[PDB]
Amino acid sequence: PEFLGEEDIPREPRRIVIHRGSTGLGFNIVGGEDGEGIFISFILAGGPADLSGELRKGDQILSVNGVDLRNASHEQAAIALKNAGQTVTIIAQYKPEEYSRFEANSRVDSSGRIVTD
């Protein structure tokens, strides 16, 4: 029995293309205060982000269509994503410890997964 859970989630940056289609992009973000960063907090089942299969809760969004968002405000990230067109190219990086600061009663387990009590 070879569980995925027991193997580390890659920590290096990745490139993900989402296809907006006829809905939103299917995820929510938190953060954006004073350069703390923009993090994915929720991925909607069946939505474009989910259909991509390459994003997760705890990913920081480093850029949208080449536009740097590491230090962007929440409103700025939202605007950029809204305007990024049909084909949205995201650079993302999994940062669960940093993400876990934002979600109440959450922490990172020894496998690097985000847990919430």
PDB file of N, CA, C and O in Angstrom, residues 21-98:
ATOM      1  N   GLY A  21     -13.128  29.312 -19.293  1.00  0.00           N
ATOM      2  CA  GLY A  21     -14.389  28.876 -19.836  1.00  0.00           C
ATOM      3  C   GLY A  21     -15.452  29.912 -19.614  1.00  0.00           C
ATOM      4  O   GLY A  21     -15.205  31.098 -19.831  1.00  0.00           O
ATOM      5  N   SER A  22     -16.591  29.432 -19.124  1.00  0.00           N
ATOM      6  CA  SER A  22     -17.812  30.193 -18.953  1.00  0.00           C
ATOM      7  C   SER A  22     -18.188  30.227 -17.502  1.00  0.00           C
ATOM      8  O   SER A  22     -19.350  30.310 -17.165  1.00  0.00           O
ATOM      9  N   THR A  23     -17.197  30.154 -16.649  1.00  0.00           N
ATOM     10  CA  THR A  23     -17.466  30.278 -15.232  1.00  0.00           C
ATOM     11  C   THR A  23     -16.320  31.120 -14.677  1.00  0.00           C
ATOM     12  O   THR A  23     -15.501  31.609 -15.439  1.00  0.00           O
ATOM     13  N   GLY A  24     -16.252  31.309 -13.375  1.00  0.00           N
ATOM     14  CA  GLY A  24     -15.030  31.806 -12.784  1.00  0.00           C
ATOM     15  C   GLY A  24     -13.887  30.794 -12.842  1.00  0.00           C
ATOM     16  O   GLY A  24     -13.917  29.877 -13.627  1.00  0.00           O
ATOM     17  N   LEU A  25     -12.760  31.148 -12.220  1.00  0.00           N
ATOM     18  CA  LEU A  25     -11.625  30.273 -12.265  1.00  0.00           C
ATOM     19  C   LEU A  25     -11.718  29.140 -11.221  1.00  0.00           C
ATOM     20  O   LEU A  25     -10.954  28.238 -11.259  1.00  0.00           O
ATOM     21  N   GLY A  26     -12.646  29.262 -10.317  1.00  0.00           N
ATOM     22  CA  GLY A  26     -12.948  28.187  -9.394  1.00  0.00           C
ATOM     23  C   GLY A  26     -11.995  28.050  -8.218  1.00  0.00           C
ATOM     24  O   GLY A  26     -11.729  26.942  -7.749  1.00  0.00           O
ATOM     25  N   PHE A  27     -11.468  29.168  -7.735  1.00  0.00           N
ATOM     26  CA  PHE A  27     -10.723  29.152  -6.483  1.00  0.00           C
ATOM     27  C   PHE A  27     -10.794  30.496  -5.777  1.00  0.00           C
ATOM     28  O   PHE A  27     -11.119  31.516  -6.381  1.00  0.00           O
ATOM     29  N   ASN A  28     -10.496  30.480  -4.485  1.00  0.00           N
ATOM     30  CA  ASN A  28     -10.492  31.696  -3.682  1.00  0.00           C
ATOM     31  C   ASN A  28      -9.089  31.959  -3.159  1.00  0.00           C
ATOM     32  O   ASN A  28      -8.286  31.031  -3.038  1.00  0.00           O
ATOM     33  N   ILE A  29      -8.800  33.223  -2.862  1.00  0.00           N
ATOM     34  CA  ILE A  29      -7.492  33.614  -2.358  1.00  0.00           C
ATOM     35  C   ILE A  29      -7.608  34.339  -1.023  1.00  0.00           C
ATOM     36  O   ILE A  29      -8.637  34.938  -0.706  1.00  0.00           O
ATOM     37  N   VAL A  30      -6.581  34.246  -0.233  1.00  0.00           N
ATOM     38  CA  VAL A  30      -6.428  35.054   0.952  1.00  0.00           C
ATOM     39  C   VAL A  30      -5.048  35.723   0.942  1.00  0.00           C
ATOM     40  O   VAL A  30      -4.238  35.386   0.132  1.00  0.00           O
ATOM     41  N   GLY A  31      -4.833  36.657   1.878  1.00  0.00           N
ATOM     42  CA  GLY A  31      -3.559  37.335   1.995  1.00  0.00           C
ATOM     43  C   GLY A  31      -3.589  38.717   1.368  1.00  0.00           C
ATOM     44  O   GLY A  31      -4.645  39.341   1.263  1.00  0.00           O
ATOM     45  N   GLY A  32      -2.423  39.198   0.957  1.00  0.00           N
ATOM     46  CA  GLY A  32      -2.335  40.445   0.221  1.00  0.00           C
ATOM     47  C   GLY A  32      -2.028  41.659   1.074  1.00  0.00           C
ATOM     48  O   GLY A  32      -1.878  42.762   0.554  1.00  0.00           O
ATOM     49  N   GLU A  33      -1.909  41.477   2.370  1.00  0.00           N
ATOM     50  CA  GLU A  33      -1.545  42.594   3.241  1.00  0.00           C
ATOM     51  C   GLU A  33      -0.045  42.695   3.325  1.00  0.00           C
ATOM     52  O   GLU A  33       0.573  41.797   3.838  1.00  0.00           O
ATOM     53  N   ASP A  34       0.424  43.913   3.054  1.00  0.00           N
ATOM     54  CA  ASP A  34       1.823  44.257   3.284  1.00  0.00           C
ATOM     55  C   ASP A  34       2.799  43.209   2.746  1.00  0.00           C
ATOM     56  O   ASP A  34       3.718  42.792   3.450  1.00  0.00           O
ATOM     57  N   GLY A  35       2.604  42.789   1.498  1.00  0.00           N
ATOM     58  CA  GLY A  35       3.525  41.860   0.864  1.00  0.00           C
ATOM     59  C   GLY A  35       3.606  40.469   1.470  1.00  0.00           C
ATOM     60  O   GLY A  35       4.590  39.756   1.264  1.00  0.00           O
ATOM     61  N   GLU A  36       2.577  40.070   2.211  1.00  0.00           N
ATOM     62  CA  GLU A  36       2.565  38.751   2.834  1.00  0.00           C
ATOM     63  C   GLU A  36       2.320  37.665   1.793  1.00  0.00           C
ATOM     64  O   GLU A  36       2.631  36.498   2.023  1.00  0.00           O
ATOM     65  N   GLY A  37       1.762  38.057   0.650  1.00  0.00           N
ATOM     66  CA  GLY A  37       1.537  37.133  -0.447  1.00  0.00           C
ATOM     67  C   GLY A  37       0.089  36.747  -0.671  1.00  0.00           C
ATOM     68  O   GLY A  37      -0.769  36.966   0.187  1.00  0.00           O
ATOM     69  N   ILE A  38      -0.179  36.146  -1.831  1.00  0.00           N
ATOM     70  CA  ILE A  38      -1.517  35.722  -2.235  1.00  0.00           C
ATOM     71  C   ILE A  38      -1.541  34.209  -2.243  1.00  0.00           C
ATOM     72  O   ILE A  38      -0.749  33.599  -2.942  1.00  0.00           O
ATOM     73  N   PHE A  39      -2.451  33.612  -1.480  1.00  0.00           N
ATOM     74  CA  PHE A  39      -2.464  32.161  -1.304  1.00  0.00           C
ATOM     75  C   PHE A  39      -3.829  31.612  -1.668  1.00  0.00           C
ATOM     76  O   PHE A  39      -4.859  32.252  -1.420  1.00  0.00           O
ATOM     77  N   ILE A  40      -3.846  30.441  -2.292  1.00  0.00           N
ATOM     78  CA  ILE A  40      -5.098  29.746  -2.567  1.00  0.00           C
ATOM     79  C   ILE A  40      -5.637  29.132  -1.270  1.00  0.00           C
ATOM     80  O   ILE A  40      -4.951  28.351  -0.608  1.00  0.00           O
ATOM     81  N   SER A  41      -6.878  29.476  -0.933  1.00  0.00           N
ATOM     82  CA  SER A  41      -7.520  29.030   0.295  1.00  0.00           C
ATOM     83  C   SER A  41      -8.583  27.958   0.054  1.00  0.00           C
ATOM     84  O   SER A  41      -9.016  27.285   0.990  1.00  0.00           O
ATOM     85  N   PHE A  42      -9.019  27.828  -1.194  1.00  0.00           N
ATOM     86  CA  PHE A  42     -10.165  26.981  -1.544  1.00  0.00           C
ATOM     87  C   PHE A  42     -10.179  26.715  -3.038  1.00  0.00           C
ATOM     88  O   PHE A  42     -10.023  27.654  -3.833  1.00  0.00           O
ATOM     89  N   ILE A  43     -10.370  25.455  -3.422  1.00  0.00           N
ATOM     90  CA  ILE A  43     -10.546  25.106  -4.823  1.00  0.00           C
ATOM     91  C   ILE A  43     -11.913  24.469  -4.980  1.00  0.00           C
ATOM     92  O   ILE A  43     -12.239  23.503  -4.293  1.00  0.00           O
ATOM     93  N   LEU A  44     -12.707  25.010  -5.895  1.00  0.00           N
ATOM     94  CA  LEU A  44     -14.063  24.530  -6.102  1.00  0.00           C
ATOM     95  C   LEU A  44     -14.079  23.220  -6.887  1.00  0.00           C
ATOM     96  O   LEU A  44     -13.469  23.108  -7.957  1.00  0.00           O
ATOM     97  N   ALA A  45     -14.772  22.231  -6.347  1.00  0.00           N
ATOM     98  CA  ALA A  45     -14.916  20.950  -7.027  1.00  0.00           C
ATOM     99  C   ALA A  45     -15.542  21.164  -8.395  1.00  0.00           C
ATOM    100  O   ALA A  45     -16.570  21.827  -8.518  1.00  0.00           O
ATOM    101  N   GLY A  46     -14.898  20.635  -9.432  1.00  0.00           N
ATOM    102  CA  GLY A  46     -15.449  20.711 -10.770  1.00  0.00           C
ATOM    103  C   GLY A  46     -15.107  21.976 -11.526  1.00  0.00           C
ATOM    104  O   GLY A  46     -15.344  22.057 -12.734  1.00  0.00           O
ATOM    105  N   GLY A  47     -14.552  22.962 -10.825  1.00  0.00           N
ATOM    106  CA  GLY A  47     -14.161  24.217 -11.437  1.00  0.00           C
ATOM    107  C   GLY A  47     -12.867  24.136 -12.225  1.00  0.00           C
ATOM    108  O   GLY A  47     -12.168  23.134 -12.181  1.00  0.00           O
ATOM    109  N   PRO A  48     -12.526  25.206 -12.954  1.00  0.00           N
ATOM    110  CA  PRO A  48     -11.342  25.201 -13.825  1.00  0.00           C
ATOM    111  C   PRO A  48     -10.037  24.861 -13.107  1.00  0.00           C
ATOM    112  O   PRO A  48      -9.262  24.049 -13.616  1.00  0.00           O
ATOM    113  N   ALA A  49      -9.800  25.463 -11.949  1.00  0.00           N
ATOM    114  CA  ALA A  49      -8.612  25.157 -11.155  1.00  0.00           C
ATOM    115  C   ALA A  49      -8.566  23.666 -10.792  1.00  0.00           C
ATOM    116  O   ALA A  49      -7.517  23.018 -10.897  1.00  0.00           O
ATOM    117  N   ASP A  50      -9.702  23.126 -10.370  1.00  0.00           N
ATOM    118  CA  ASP A  50      -9.810  21.705 -10.045  1.00  0.00           C
ATOM    119  C   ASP A  50      -9.577  20.839 -11.283  1.00  0.00           C
ATOM    120  O   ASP A  50      -8.862  19.840 -11.224  1.00  0.00           O
ATOM    121  N   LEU A  51     -10.193  21.222 -12.395  1.00  0.00           N
ATOM    122  CA  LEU A  51     -10.063  20.471 -13.640  1.00  0.00           C
ATOM    123  C   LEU A  51      -8.601  20.439 -14.110  1.00  0.00           C
ATOM    124  O   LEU A  51      -8.189  19.508 -14.786  1.00  0.00           O
ATOM    125  N   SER A  52      -7.819  21.448 -13.729  1.00  0.00           N
ATOM    126  CA  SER A  52      -6.398  21.487 -14.073  1.00  0.00           C
ATOM    127  C   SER A  52      -5.636  20.406 -13.313  1.00  0.00           C
ATOM    128  O   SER A  52      -4.651  19.856 -13.812  1.00  0.00           O
ATOM    129  N   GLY A  53      -6.094  20.115 -12.097  1.00  0.00           N
ATOM    130  CA  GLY A  53      -5.475  19.106 -11.262  1.00  0.00           C
ATOM    131  C   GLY A  53      -4.091  19.449 -10.749  1.00  0.00           C
ATOM    132  O   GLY A  53      -3.394  18.577 -10.247  1.00  0.00           O
ATOM    133  N   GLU A  54      -3.688  20.712 -10.850  1.00  0.00           N
ATOM    134  CA  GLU A  54      -2.305  21.072 -10.546  1.00  0.00           C
ATOM    135  C   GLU A  54      -2.165  22.170  -9.497  1.00  0.00           C
ATOM    136  O   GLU A  54      -1.056  22.605  -9.206  1.00  0.00           O
ATOM    137  N   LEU A  55      -3.280  22.623  -8.939  1.00  0.00           N
ATOM    138  CA  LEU A  55      -3.248  23.630  -7.881  1.00  0.00           C
ATOM    139  C   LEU A  55      -3.826  23.060  -6.614  1.00  0.00           C
ATOM    140  O   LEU A  55      -4.631  22.141  -6.661  1.00  0.00           O
ATOM    141  N   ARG A  56      -3.407  23.604  -5.479  1.00  0.00           N
ATOM    142  CA  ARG A  56      -3.950  23.177  -4.206  1.00  0.00           C
ATOM    143  C   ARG A  56      -3.968  24.309  -3.206  1.00  0.00           C
ATOM    144  O   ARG A  56      -3.221  25.286  -3.312  1.00  0.00           O
ATOM    145  N   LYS A  57      -4.900  24.126  -2.173  1.00  0.00           N
ATOM    146  CA  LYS A  57      -4.894  24.930  -0.962  1.00  0.00           C
ATOM    147  C   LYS A  57      -3.467  25.034  -0.440  1.00  0.00           C
ATOM    148  O   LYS A  57      -2.781  24.019  -0.302  1.00  0.00           O
ATOM    149  N   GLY A  58      -3.016  26.256  -0.167  1.00  0.00           N
ATOM    150  CA  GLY A  58      -1.678  26.464   0.367  1.00  0.00           C
ATOM    151  C   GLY A  58      -0.652  26.884  -0.667  1.00  0.00           C
ATOM    152  O   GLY A  58       0.473  27.254  -0.308  1.00  0.00           O
ATOM    153  N   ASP A  59      -1.020  26.820  -1.949  1.00  0.00           N
ATOM    154  CA  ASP A  59      -0.187  27.373  -3.008  1.00  0.00           C
ATOM    155  C   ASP A  59      -0.179  28.894  -2.935  1.00  0.00           C
ATOM    156  O   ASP A  59      -1.237  29.514  -2.822  1.00  0.00           O
ATOM    157  N   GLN A  60       1.006  29.498  -3.027  1.00  0.00           N
ATOM    158  CA  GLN A  60       1.095  30.934  -3.262  1.00  0.00           C
ATOM    159  C   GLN A  60       1.061  31.225  -4.756  1.00  0.00           C
ATOM    160  O   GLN A  60       1.695  30.527  -5.543  1.00  0.00           O
ATOM    161  N   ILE A  61       0.321  32.255  -5.152  1.00  0.00           N
ATOM    162  CA  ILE A  61       0.306  32.669  -6.549  1.00  0.00           C
ATOM    163  C   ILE A  61       1.400  33.715  -6.754  1.00  0.00           C
ATOM    164  O   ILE A  61       1.265  34.859  -6.323  1.00  0.00           O
ATOM    165  N   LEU A  62       2.479  33.311  -7.418  1.00  0.00           N
ATOM    166  CA  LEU A  62       3.616  34.194  -7.667  1.00  0.00           C
ATOM    167  C   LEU A  62       3.375  35.146  -8.844  1.00  0.00           C
ATOM    168  O   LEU A  62       3.825  36.289  -8.820  1.00  0.00           O
ATOM    169  N   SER A  63       2.684  34.673  -9.879  1.00  0.00           N
ATOM    170  CA  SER A  63       2.354  35.521 -11.027  1.00  0.00           C
ATOM    171  C   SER A  63       1.132  35.025 -11.794  1.00  0.00           C
ATOM    172  O   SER A  63       0.798  33.836 -11.759  1.00  0.00           O
ATOM    173  N   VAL A  64       0.464  35.962 -12.463  1.00  0.00           N
ATOM    174  CA  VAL A  64      -0.668  35.674 -13.342  1.00  0.00           C
ATOM    175  C   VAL A  64      -0.324  36.274 -14.708  1.00  0.00           C
ATOM    176  O   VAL A  64      -0.093  37.475 -14.822  1.00  0.00           O
ATOM    177  N   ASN A  65      -0.277  35.429 -15.734  1.00  0.00           N
ATOM    178  CA  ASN A  65       0.136  35.850 -17.079  1.00  0.00           C
ATOM    179  C   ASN A  65       1.397  36.715 -17.060  1.00  0.00           C
ATOM    180  O   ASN A  65       1.454  37.757 -17.713  1.00  0.00           O
ATOM    181  N   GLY A  66       2.407  36.273 -16.316  1.00  0.00           N
ATOM    182  CA  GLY A  66       3.668  36.987 -16.229  1.00  0.00           C
ATOM    183  C   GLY A  66       3.702  38.198 -15.309  1.00  0.00           C
ATOM    184  O   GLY A  66       4.773  38.724 -15.030  1.00  0.00           O
ATOM    185  N   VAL A  67       2.543  38.650 -14.839  1.00  0.00           N
ATOM    186  CA  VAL A  67       2.491  39.788 -13.926  1.00  0.00           C
ATOM    187  C   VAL A  67       2.796  39.343 -12.503  1.00  0.00           C
ATOM    188  O   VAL A  67       2.101  38.503 -11.938  1.00  0.00           O
ATOM    189  N   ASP A  68       3.837  39.928 -11.924  1.00  0.00           N
ATOM    190  CA  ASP A  68       4.256  39.603 -10.564  1.00  0.00           C
ATOM    191  C   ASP A  68       3.190  39.958  -9.517  1.00  0.00           C
ATOM    192  O   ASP A  68       2.694  41.080  -9.482  1.00  0.00           O
ATOM    193  N   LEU A  69       2.842  38.994  -8.664  1.00  0.00           N
ATOM    194  CA  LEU A  69       1.808  39.195  -7.648  1.00  0.00           C
ATOM    195  C   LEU A  69       2.276  38.885  -6.232  1.00  0.00           C
ATOM    196  O   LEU A  69       1.472  38.869  -5.296  1.00  0.00           O
ATOM    197  N   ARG A  70       3.567  38.623  -6.069  1.00  0.00           N
ATOM    198  CA  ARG A  70       4.093  38.209  -4.774  1.00  0.00           C
ATOM    199  C   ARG A  70       3.777  39.227  -3.692  1.00  0.00           C
ATOM    200  O   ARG A  70       3.545  38.870  -2.537  1.00  0.00           O
ATOM    201  N   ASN A  71       3.782  40.499  -4.067  1.00  0.00           N
ATOM    202  CA  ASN A  71       3.562  41.553  -3.101  1.00  0.00           C
ATOM    203  C   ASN A  71       2.247  42.263  -3.341  1.00  0.00           C
ATOM    204  O   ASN A  71       2.004  43.287  -2.748  1.00  0.00           O
ATOM    205  N   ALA A  72       1.388  41.695  -4.179  1.00  0.00           N
ATOM    206  CA  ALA A  72       0.120  42.332  -4.541  1.00  0.00           C
ATOM    207  C   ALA A  72      -0.901  42.310  -3.405  1.00  0.00           C
ATOM    208  O   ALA A  72      -0.883  41.415  -2.570  1.00  0.00           O
ATOM    209  N   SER A  73      -1.812  43.281  -3.405  1.00  0.00           N
ATOM    210  CA  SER A  73      -2.960  43.261  -2.503  1.00  0.00           C
ATOM    211  C   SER A  73      -4.000  42.250  -2.984  1.00  0.00           C
ATOM    212  O   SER A  73      -3.960  41.797  -4.124  1.00  0.00           O
ATOM    213  N   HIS A  74      -4.932  41.900  -2.106  1.00  0.00           N
ATOM    214  CA  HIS A  74      -6.014  40.990  -2.457  1.00  0.00           C
ATOM    215  C   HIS A  74      -6.811  41.542  -3.642  1.00  0.00           C
ATOM    216  O   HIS A  74      -7.078  40.837  -4.612  1.00  0.00           O
ATOM    217  N   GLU A  75      -7.169  42.821  -3.568  1.00  0.00           N
ATOM    218  CA  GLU A  75      -7.918  43.465  -4.642  1.00  0.00           C
ATOM    219  C   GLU A  75      -7.123  43.402  -5.946  1.00  0.00           C
ATOM    220  O   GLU A  75      -7.683  43.168  -7.015  1.00  0.00           O
ATOM    221  N   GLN A  76      -5.811  43.602  -5.864  1.00  0.00           N
ATOM    222  CA  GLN A  76      -4.985  43.585  -7.066  1.00  0.00           C
ATOM    223  C   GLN A  76      -4.947  42.199  -7.693  1.00  0.00           C
ATOM    224  O   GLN A  76      -5.058  42.057  -8.911  1.00  0.00           O
ATOM    225  N   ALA A  77      -4.779  41.178  -6.864  1.00  0.00           N
ATOM    226  CA  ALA A  77      -4.755  39.818  -7.375  1.00  0.00           C
ATOM    227  C   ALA A  77      -6.089  39.501  -8.036  1.00  0.00           C
ATOM    228  O   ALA A  77      -6.140  38.930  -9.132  1.00  0.00           O
ATOM    229  N   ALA A  78      -7.166  39.885  -7.362  1.00  0.00           N
ATOM    230  CA  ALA A  78      -8.505  39.611  -7.852  1.00  0.00           C
ATOM    231  C   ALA A  78      -8.695  40.261  -9.216  1.00  0.00           C
ATOM    232  O   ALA A  78      -9.212  39.645 -10.141  1.00  0.00           O
ATOM    233  N   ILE A  79      -8.254  41.508  -9.334  1.00  0.00           N
ATOM    234  CA  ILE A  79      -8.376  42.253 -10.573  1.00  0.00           C
ATOM    235  C   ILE A  79      -7.589  41.579 -11.693  1.00  0.00           C
ATOM    236  O   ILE A  79      -8.106  41.385 -12.796  1.00  0.00           O
ATOM    237  N   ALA A  80      -6.342  41.218 -11.402  1.00  0.00           N
ATOM    238  CA  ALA A  80      -5.474  40.578 -12.386  1.00  0.00           C
ATOM    239  C   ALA A  80      -6.079  39.278 -12.902  1.00  0.00           C
ATOM    240  O   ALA A  80      -5.945  38.932 -14.074  1.00  0.00           O
ATOM    241  N   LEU A  81      -6.742  38.550 -12.016  1.00  0.00           N
ATOM    242  CA  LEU A  81      -7.259  37.238 -12.360  1.00  0.00           C
ATOM    243  C   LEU A  81      -8.507  37.417 -13.205  1.00  0.00           C
ATOM    244  O   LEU A  81      -8.728  36.675 -14.153  1.00  0.00           O
ATOM    245  N   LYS A  82      -9.284  38.434 -12.848  1.00  0.00           N
ATOM    246  CA  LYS A  82     -10.495  38.826 -13.556  1.00  0.00           C
ATOM    247  C   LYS A  82     -10.208  39.246 -15.000  1.00  0.00           C
ATOM    248  O   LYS A  82     -11.038  39.050 -15.889  1.00  0.00           O
ATOM    249  N   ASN A  83      -9.028  39.820 -15.218  1.00  0.00           N
ATOM    250  CA  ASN A  83      -8.654  40.400 -16.511  1.00  0.00           C
ATOM    251  C   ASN A  83      -7.705  39.517 -17.316  1.00  0.00           C
ATOM    252  O   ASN A  83      -7.355  39.852 -18.444  1.00  0.00           O
ATOM    253  N   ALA A  84      -7.298  38.391 -16.744  1.00  0.00           N
ATOM    254  CA  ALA A  84      -6.257  37.564 -17.343  1.00  0.00           C
ATOM    255  C   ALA A  84      -6.739  36.834 -18.593  1.00  0.00           C
ATOM    256  O   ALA A  84      -5.970  36.116 -19.235  1.00  0.00           O
ATOM    257  N   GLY A  85      -8.014  36.999 -18.929  1.00  0.00           N
ATOM    258  CA  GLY A  85      -8.549  36.420 -20.146  1.00  0.00           C
ATOM    259  C   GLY A  85      -9.000  34.976 -20.022  1.00  0.00           C
ATOM    260  O   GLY A  85      -9.211  34.464 -18.923  1.00  0.00           O
ATOM    261  N   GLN A  86      -9.254  34.335 -21.160  1.00  0.00           N
ATOM    262  CA  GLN A  86      -9.671  32.935 -21.199  1.00  0.00           C
ATOM    263  C   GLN A  86      -8.607  31.956 -20.703  1.00  0.00           C
ATOM    264  O   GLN A  86      -8.940  30.902 -20.188  1.00  0.00           O
ATOM    265  N   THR A  87      -7.363  32.195 -21.091  1.00  0.00           N
ATOM    266  CA  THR A  87      -6.282  31.274 -20.762  1.00  0.00           C
ATOM    267  C   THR A  87      -5.388  31.931 -19.730  1.00  0.00           C
ATOM    268  O   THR A  87      -4.711  32.913 -20.017  1.00  0.00           O
ATOM    269  N   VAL A  88      -5.402  31.379 -18.523  1.00  0.00           N
ATOM    270  CA  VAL A  88      -4.746  31.997 -17.385  1.00  0.00           C
ATOM    271  C   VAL A  88      -3.533  31.173 -16.987  1.00  0.00           C
ATOM    272  O   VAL A  88      -3.656  30.014 -16.571  1.00  0.00           O
ATOM    273  N   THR A  89      -2.357  31.776 -17.116  1.00  0.00           N
ATOM    274  CA  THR A  89      -1.108  31.097 -16.788  1.00  0.00           C
ATOM    275  C   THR A  89      -0.604  31.547 -15.426  1.00  0.00           C
ATOM    276  O   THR A  89      -0.222  32.711 -15.239  1.00  0.00           O
ATOM    277  N   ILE A  90      -0.615  30.615 -14.478  1.00  0.00           N
ATOM    278  CA  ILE A  90      -0.244  30.898 -13.101  1.00  0.00           C
ATOM    279  C   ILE A  90       1.092  30.242 -12.782  1.00  0.00           C
ATOM    280  O   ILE A  90       1.307  29.089 -13.130  1.00  0.00           O
ATOM    281  N   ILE A  91       1.981  30.965 -12.111  1.00  0.00           N
ATOM    282  CA  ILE A  91       3.122  30.335 -11.474  1.00  0.00           C
ATOM    283  C   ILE A  91       2.775  30.240  -9.998  1.00  0.00           C
ATOM    284  O   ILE A  91       2.438  31.245  -9.359  1.00  0.00           O
ATOM    285  N   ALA A  92       2.863  29.033  -9.464  1.00  0.00           N
ATOM    286  CA  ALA A  92       2.448  28.756  -8.099  1.00  0.00           C
ATOM    287  C   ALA A  92       3.538  28.019  -7.353  1.00  0.00           C
ATOM    288  O   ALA A  92       4.346  27.304  -7.961  1.00  0.00           O
ATOM    289  N   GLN A  93       3.536  28.170  -6.031  1.00  0.00           N
ATOM    290  CA  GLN A  93       4.508  27.505  -5.180  1.00  0.00           C
ATOM    291  C   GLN A  93       3.881  27.152  -3.838  1.00  0.00           C
ATOM    292  O   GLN A  93       3.294  27.998  -3.169  1.00  0.00           O
ATOM    293  N   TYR A  94       4.011  25.888  -3.461  1.00  0.00           N
ATOM    294  CA  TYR A  94       3.342  25.347  -2.289  1.00  0.00           C
ATOM    295  C   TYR A  94       4.059  25.826  -1.036  1.00  0.00           C
ATOM    296  O   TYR A  94       5.243  25.537  -0.838  1.00  0.00           O
ATOM    297  N   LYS A  95       3.350  26.579  -0.200  1.00  0.00           N
ATOM    298  CA  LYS A  95       3.940  27.174   1.004  1.00  0.00           C
ATOM    299  C   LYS A  95       3.002  26.986   2.197  1.00  0.00           C
ATOM    300  O   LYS A  95       2.481  27.965   2.742  1.00  0.00           O
ATOM    301  N   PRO A  96       2.794  25.725   2.616  1.00  0.00           N
ATOM    302  CA  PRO A  96       1.766  25.391   3.611  1.00  0.00           C
ATOM    303  C   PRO A  96       1.978  26.029   4.984  1.00  0.00           C
ATOM    304  O   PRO A  96       0.983  26.327   5.651  1.00  0.00           O
ATOM    305  N   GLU A  97       3.224  26.227   5.403  1.00  0.00           N
ATOM    306  CA  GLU A  97       3.486  26.841   6.698  1.00  0.00           C
ATOM    307  C   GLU A  97       3.000  28.285   6.680  1.00  0.00           C
ATOM    308  O   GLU A  97       2.283  28.714   7.573  1.00  0.00           O
ATOM    309  N   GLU A  98       3.380  29.026   5.647  1.00  0.00           N
ATOM    310  CA  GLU A  98       2.923  30.402   5.479  1.00  0.00           C
ATOM    311  C   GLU A  98       1.408  30.486   5.330  1.00  0.00           C
ATOM    312  O   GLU A  98       0.774  31.394   5.877  1.00  0.00           O
TER     313      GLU A  98
END
